[PDB]
Amino acid sequence: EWQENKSWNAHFTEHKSQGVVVLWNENKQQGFTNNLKRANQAFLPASTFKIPNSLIALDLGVVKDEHQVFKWDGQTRDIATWNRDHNLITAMKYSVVPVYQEFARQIGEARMSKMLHAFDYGNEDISGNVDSFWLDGGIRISATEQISFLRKLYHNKLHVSERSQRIVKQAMLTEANGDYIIRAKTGYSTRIEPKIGWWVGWVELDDNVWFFAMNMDMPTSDGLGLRQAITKEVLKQEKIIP
Numbered sequence: 001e002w003q004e005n006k007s008w009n010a011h012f013t014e015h016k017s018q019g020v021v022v023l024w025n026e027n028k029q030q031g032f033t034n035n036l037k038r039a040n041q042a043f044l045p046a047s048t049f050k051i052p053n054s055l056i057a058l059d060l061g062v063v064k065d066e067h068q069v070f071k072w073d074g075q076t077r078d079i080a081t082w083n084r085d086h087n088l089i090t091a092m093k094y095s096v097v098p099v100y101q102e103f104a105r106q107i108g109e110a111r112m113s114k115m116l117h118a119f120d121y122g123n124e125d126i127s128g129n130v131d132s133f134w135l136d137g138g139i140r141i142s143a144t145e146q147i148s149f150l151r152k153l154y155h156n157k158l159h160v161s162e163r164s165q166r167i168v169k170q171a172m173l174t175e176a177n178g179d180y181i182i183r184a185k186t187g188y189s190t191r192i193e194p195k196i197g198w199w200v201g202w203v204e205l206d207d208n209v210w211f212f213a214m215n216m217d218m219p220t221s222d223g224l225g226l227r228q229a230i231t232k233e234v235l236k237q238e239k240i241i242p
């Protein structure tokens with residue numbers, strides 16, 4: 001069962017933006033979205049792909065654990081936090097593309113493709129360059145498809161070891177307080193129109209889990225903070241967080 005709630009559209013329009021929020025109640029196995037059509041429209045995953053990429057890299061031994069240091073290659077890039085050493089935790093936190101591009105190159109096309117099919121991830125198409133296909137290649141995934149993938153990850157049901165899934169879920173840790181835990185990954189797709197921002201993950205409560213996946217038009221980087229802000233307004237409206 002799915003239900004549409006266009007009242008959430010107010011949260012996007014107050015910022016003159018457009019997008020979709022998709023919520024899934026795990027206990028009740030019920031979904032909610034403001035836009036059933038956009039909820040099933042497929043976009044580039046961009047840095048949300050760092051979830052599956054991390055899983056594959058860990059399971060194949062490309063990444064040993066969350067402490068392995070990936071040394072900066074010495075190339076100054078326009079994002080300051082990228083010009084330093086990183087481990088899996090910080091590379092996720094700061095969405096350090098060049099680290100994951102090296103992951104992908106060491107994974108290779110053949111194993112990457114076979115693993116995304118085992119994950120049933122989006123359209124499972126890695127066409128493009130192995131080190132950027134999730135940024136300007138052929139891979140596509142919808143908001144509802146994100147939730148389906150994240151739900152498997154939460155239950156350790158993806159076709160990789162339990163360890164790899166626990167480690168990635170640790171690396172996804174974004175916020176935690178006395179009321180909730182959020183594990184999620186942001187995304188920013190700019191190389192192919194339409195330019196969008198992602199935020200996908202779930203909300204852990206004492207007695208339930210709310211999975212979420214949102215994307216929204218993002219014509220400039222100035223609005224990236226809206227990905228979390230709009231999502232949280234929906235969570236508040238549905239009384240999922242205070």
Ligand SMILES: COC(=O)c1ccccc1-c1cccc(C(=O)O)c1
Pocket residue numbers: 047079094095186187188189190221224
């Ligand atoms: C693809 O383009 C950028 O990533 C980008 C471009 C301009 C300014 C900032 C970023 C950036 C950097 C780090 C994280 C995020 C994010 O929140 O996913 C975004």
